[PDB]
């Protein structure tokens, strides 16, 4: 209570230095922590593939797509597409899709993570918890916290890494060392399986006891909670949308003084990407073995009391870890820094969403754009996004069995792959047109909604109570649909655009990867030695990542 | 033991990187 109050007082009074901090904060945030711990408890190590593939995606971003964003001169994605394609229609629809994705993932998961952290600590149920978090974020933003966020990000990531290392040290000690994780985890099961409710009936051993292959990263391809054939490619697509299209990420990456400095920052970010496995997934399953009945229950009657949802609330593992396993005095430091990072991320998402909407939608709708009225529109947009995100919380807590990170991956894999296909085809093949790309992308969006809307209306339930969803619609994994949508939306944009030769070469000078360097005028559609050592460092870091992958795989 | 699997993974993927290194050259 003292440490948390002092930390909040310091933060409010205040309101590869920024690059690494921003990259890690987006990579490993508060909602990211809680979701990673939860799915680590429910499923096992396998969720580590998410981080270990996002690492490779960050490396690919830094090595390939940052120079493309730099030579062209477009800091953001939508203006790069504006110069590449032309026409406010495609940029408008892409901004609409970005707004929807922000609402569906960023804000919703941030608020729900705050609710999970507060719910297993001082406070109340989800509604009061998110109301208090809204108050905290508002008082943060009013006092210009975002302005000093650039300086505070490095301090926050340093203290988060320090605290997470302390939690690493404490967790295996509370279990008995690394031997305890390989010894005790597979026997972690609740004592309550009676299911006094007559409708539910006696639960089979499949649900409450953990999966037998909860250790290995690579699950069964067909029948499994998280297949690896889906993992490797679907994560590539989703995280390629995440890292190579986010405006904030590219703005932070390009902020480096030189290209070699950008690559060094990417390598340091990779170092910080290899650690959150041991910091999140291991302690989540440690919290599961420590607290088997509380963390992962399967009987709905007890589950509503413990969780608030009938799924099982496997995602409350990390709040319990923080508020029990930590030393009594120091737990306030975690409960303070966790919420501070969450509030900073939420404020950044709020500002980015409002700026995007103002810059594209209301700008195209009303070309007058009175400054007072425009600011009023921005404030009303913030109000609207808060209301919609809070109204979406009951769907968020379900999240296909309570795994919060599964919800993020599902939503992104439903609506990102079309944008990824459009971007990759625009960057690779010159033939794609503005009308062709838009007409493919609208079809991809319809295809994605055709599987999202019925699934979310029907439900997911749990293993005990599956929803009355058709076998073909829900038996397909929530992430294999991203692989299907990649080669459906991209096929549509490649086929529609190929109907004619829409754009000559002069409009696409130094904007298409094929013509990386032309040294010619555009058509206006509107370290010599450090490099080898940096490449060697990247080779070493990537080899270490593969070593860990093969160790657990 | 997992460490032999990790060593095999490193060897295989380093061989892959070395093979791909000739593409640019």
UniProtKB/Swiss-Prot annotation, chain A:
Q: Which InterPro entries match?
A: Na/Glc_symporter_sf (IPR038377), Na/solute_symporter (IPR001734), Na/solute_symporter_CS (IPR018212)
* Glycosylation site list: 202
GO terms classed as biological process? alpha-glucoside transport; carbohydrate metabolic process; D-glucose import across plasma membrane; hexose transmembrane transport; renal D-glucose absorption; sodium ion import across plasma membrane; sodium ion transport
Activity regulation:
Enhanced by the interaction with PDZK1IP1/MAP17. Inhibited by natural product phlorizin and diabetic drugs, including empagliflozin and dapagliflozin, canagliflozin, and sotagliflozin. Empagliflozin is selective for SLC5A2/SGLT2 over SLC5A1/SGLT1 and it inhibits by occupying the sugar-binding site in SLC5A2.
Output the Gene Ontology terms for molecular function: alpha-glucoside transmembrane transporter activity; D-glucose transmembrane transporter activity; D-glucose:sodium symporter activity; low-affinity D-glucose:sodium symporter activity; metal ion binding
Membrane topology category: Multi-pass membrane protein
Q: Where are the transmembrane segments?
A: 1-15, 16-37, 46-66, 89-118, 126-147, 148-169, 228-247, 262-283, 328-358, 377-398, 404-429, 435-457, 476-499, 533-551
Residues in the Cytoplasmic compartment per record? 67-88, 248-261, 359-376, 430-434
UniProt keywords (A-Z) are:
Cell membrane, Disease variant, Disulfide bond, Glycoprotein, Ion transport, Membrane, Metal-binding, Sodium, Sodium transport, Sugar transport, Symport, Transmembrane, Transmembrane helix, Transport
Query: Where in or outside the cell?
Result: Apical cell membrane
Primary localization: membrane
What happens on changing residue 109 to A?
Answer: Decreases D-glucose transporter activity. Impairs inhibition by empagliflozin on glucose uptake
GO CC annotations, alphabetized: apical plasma membrane; extracellular exosome; membrane; plasma membrane
The set of disulfide-linked cysteines is 207-463, 297-303, 307-313, 469-474
Organism's domain of life?
Eukaryota
Effect the entry attributes to changing residue 26 to A: Impairs phlorizin binding and its inhibition on glucose uptake
Record: disease: Renal glucosuria: A disorder characterized by persistent isolated glucosuria, normal fasting serum glucose concentration, decreased renal tubular resorption of glucose from the urine, and absence of any other signs of tubular dysfunction.
Give the record's family classification: Belongs to the sodium:solute symporter (SSF) (TC 2.A.21) family.
Q: Which PANTHER family match?
A: SODIUM_GLUCOSE COTRANSPORTER 2, SOLUTE CARRIER FAMILY 5
Assembly and interaction partners? Forms a heterodimer (via TM13) with PDZK1IP1 (via N-terminal transmembrane helix); this interaction enhances SLC5A2 transporter activity.
- What's the protein here called? Sodium/glucose cotransporter 2
Swiss-Prot record, chain B:
List the transmembrane segments. 2-24
Location(s), subcellular = Apical cell membrane
Subunit record text: Forms a heterodimer (via N-terminal transmembrane helix) with SLC5A2/SGLT2 (via TM13); this interaction enhances SLC5A2 transporter activity. Interacts with PDZK1.
Q: Which family does it belong to?
A: Belongs to the PDZK1-interacting protein 1/SMIM24 family.
As for what it does, the entry says:
Auxiliary protein of electrogenic Na(+)-coupled sugar symporter SLC5A2/SGLT2 and SLC5A1/SGLT1. Essential for the transporter activity of SLC5A2/SGLT2 but not SLC5A1/SGLT1.
The protein here is known as PDZK1-interacting protein 1
According to its UniProt entry, this protein's organism is Homo sapiens (Human)
Covered range within the whole protein?
Answer: 28 to 52 of 114
